Amino acid sequence: KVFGRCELAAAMKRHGLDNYRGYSLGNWVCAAKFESNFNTQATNRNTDGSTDYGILQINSRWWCNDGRTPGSRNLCNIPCSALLSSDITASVNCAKKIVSDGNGMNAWVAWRNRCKGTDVQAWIRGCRL
Numbered sequence: 001k002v003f004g005r006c007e008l009a010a011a012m013k014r015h016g017l018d019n020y021r022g023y024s025l026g027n028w029v030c031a032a033k034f035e036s037n038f039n040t041q042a043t044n045r046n047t048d049g050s051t052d053y054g055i056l057q058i059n060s061r062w063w064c065n066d067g068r069t070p071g072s073r074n075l076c077n078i079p080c081s082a083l084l085s086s087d088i089t090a091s092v093n094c095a096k097k098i099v100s101d102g103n104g105m106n107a108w109v110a111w112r113n114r115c116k117g118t119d120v121q122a123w124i125r126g127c128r129l
């Protein structure tokens with residue numbers, strides 16, 4: 001599923017990401033924009049053989065099991081394919097665990113490079129939330 005901007009914002013808000021650990025809704029929508037272009041089916045292979053999955057490009061090295069990342073962890077305890085669903089529940093739940101591990105949203109390189117320190121509220125602007 002390719003979400004609309006406000007559609008995703010509302011779905012995220014409903015799943016409790018607004019101000020989750022100090023990160024306002026605009027941060028998560030910006031992050032999802034540049035990681036996956038709002039596409040839940042987005043996948044990307046890393047040079048180390050791991051793969052990033054879904055709307056927030058969660059990495060198989062640490063967070064999910066895809067059965068082809070030797071010596072990796074499954075810290076969110078899910079198959080990586082679960083992160084590709086049109087229902088974003090598993091991605092959101094796993095994201096909550098990632099953002100709490102000490103490094104905040106700096107875990108997402110696109111957020112750090114493209115969202116951090118920008119006017120992130122522009123991403124939820126005009127949306128009925």
Ligand SMILES: [Cl-]
Nearest residue numbers: 022103104105
């Ligand atoms: Cl933080």
Ligand code: NA
Nearest residue numbers: 060064072073
């Ligand atoms: Na893994």
